[PDB]
Design a protein around this ligand. Structure first.
Ligand code: UED
Ligand code: UED
Lengths: 306, 306
């Protein structure tokens, strides 16, 4: 029993974190096979970050301006290119520890583990969600750039995130590992808006299901509702519209629990209109939306490796 | 910026998790050098767990009744003993991946990372605190026993917890790695009370300091207080008495922030007497107590490896 914000075991991605230095800036880089991925703003100086002409800065750079080291071992750089906002550094040595891996562009509402690094060395793992507005509520100090987000499936690391910047609101933004930002962001030290952040309704329901599974059942109603009437309630409260594949995705949880999805939505509507009245659900006084249905099932089922 | 429940990188302890089987029961075990530590109730059968005579069950056991495997590799057992509630299985092979390690008995209020395992394979990491009442609010399904809790310092793994059982309240109990339970617990399938759980006051303050550091400053008062008068407030609300080495431990946070500790206590007294009025602190509507002062400093400072 019990439900926790659980990150993936980080051992596979640990052996992939390197230090990438270019002049005074040091960032983290991801060493897979014989290429090192890192945020391209490693090539920026003190001033360049207001509005960098990245191709023009990269031209001033040669292979030997890129100090990359894995722990103590310095790797020789035999090639560099820029793919979108990511620098790809070809190195002579294949990482002896590259795991089976995929690059994937995750979708909003999906979660992933972040291995927060500084100076190529790991300092912590936590779980977070790609918000609907394509930001993450992370914990990133200076030098954390190039820290990566990932999922594990069997022995397969699925890298989906590389950290680039902090916004004015204090949330975080970053790219997929092909260097394309999630969201409308650009890697400049400029004021950039994220949109309104909506709540991931299907995740909240999955967390209500985990709550029922774990004994928290006070919020269970005697009511029901309809997709459309709940969806009018969702829009009042900046909740993403619940759709028919959402109820289908909750199917396993609905069956394992014997609570129809729309009975759960009607429970959620009451929580949204009457608050929690100072009660708690799974040790929280807020509605939690960083648990996907798969997170719940994996945790309430104990799926290993992954 | 940002503050998250961060676990330690789990790579070092991953390479130490094995499967230990004895008849029908399978648990996780910790393979360090040529010994495998695992909960002694691996030797229990269906019925034995109501009130096991553990020495009498262990006598029926020989070295070859202990199937331990690391991934696919089965290790030969060359010796077994029982130290308190832990079985020590001597194996012929030293783990080629044992990290620098210590066994430590952590104190209440301290935190640690848990690597939740099933069948000797890791499935997730999360952070939790040894409650004042010596339980943990974990996430542990069947087969999770032998999962371990740990801290990292430089390259040094400090193992402090091994999971044994779930209580009626759904919290979790376990031993240090010398097999002595934290708390008044015994490894029987019996109804066992933990005490009232008090809130770790010094941790709540450290989290208020992290909140100020991260921009959340609405709760800051114009009041002050005294250790004794706050401590009368703490006792009303099941908060552990704040002591003089507690304010001294908060010293670095008090200095880095310019908020006297007793000004913070007076802010905490107001939160305790007037609630949060539907506001949030660091994305939470509850007062959080699973962050020690060192957790805050490490996170607000970015300390690596550890
Ligand atoms: C990469 O190490 C860094 C991560 C920031 C630093 C503090 N917290 C973070 O998430 N990213 C940047 O410094 C980025 C540089 C651009 C050229 C992409 N600028 C940025 O994020 O500005 C916001 C900021 C806030 C607080 C301190 C420094 C920068
Ligand atoms: C070890 O794998 C297991 C962990 C329990 C199982 C479910 N959640 C847990 O934390 N520990 C035990 O099964 C323990 C056996 C005693 C001989 C130590 N008994 C126990 O914890 O009883 C409570 C329980 C609750 C729900 C399912 C099974 C047992």
């Amino acid at each position: 029993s019990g439900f926790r914000k659980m990150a993936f075991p980080s051992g596979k991605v640990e052996g992939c974190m390197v230090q990438v230095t270019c002049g005074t800036t040091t960032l983290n880089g991801l060493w897979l096979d014989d290429v090192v991925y890192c945020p391209r703003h490693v090539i920026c100086t003190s001033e360049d970050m207001l509005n960098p002409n990245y191709e023009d800065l990269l031209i001033r750079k040669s292979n030997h301006n890129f100090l990359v080291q894995a722990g103590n071992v310095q790797l020789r750089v035999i090639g560099h290119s820029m793919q979108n906002c990511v620098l790809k550094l070809k190195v002579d040595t294949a990482n002896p520890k590259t795991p089976k891996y995929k690059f994937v562009r995750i979708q909003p509402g999906q979660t992933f583990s972040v291995l927060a690094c500084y100076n190529g060395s790991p300092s912590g793992v936590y779980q977070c969600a790609m918000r609907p507005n394509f930001t993450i509520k992370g914990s990133f100090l200076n030098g954390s750039c190039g820290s990566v987000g990932f999922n594990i499936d069997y022995d397969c690391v699925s890298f989906c995130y590389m950290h680039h910047m902090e916004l004015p609101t204090g949330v975080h933004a970053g790219t997929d590992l092909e260097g394309n930002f999630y969201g409308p962001f650009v890697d400049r030290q400029t004021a950039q808006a994220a949109g309104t952040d909506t709540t991931i309704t299907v995740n909240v329901l999955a967390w209500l299901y985990a709550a029922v599974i774990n004994g928290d059942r006070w919020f269970l109603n005697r009511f029901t509702t309809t997709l459309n009437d709940f969806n009018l309630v969702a829009m009042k409260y900046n909740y993403e519209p619940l759709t028919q594949d959402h109820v289908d995705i909750l199917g396993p949880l609905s069956a394992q629990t014997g609570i129809a999805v729309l009975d759960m939505c009607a429970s959620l509507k009451e929580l949204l209109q009457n608050g929690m009245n100072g009660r708690t659900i799974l040790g929280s006084a807020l509605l939690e939306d960083e648990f996907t249905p798969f997170d719940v099932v994996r945790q309430c089922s104990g799926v290993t490796f992954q």
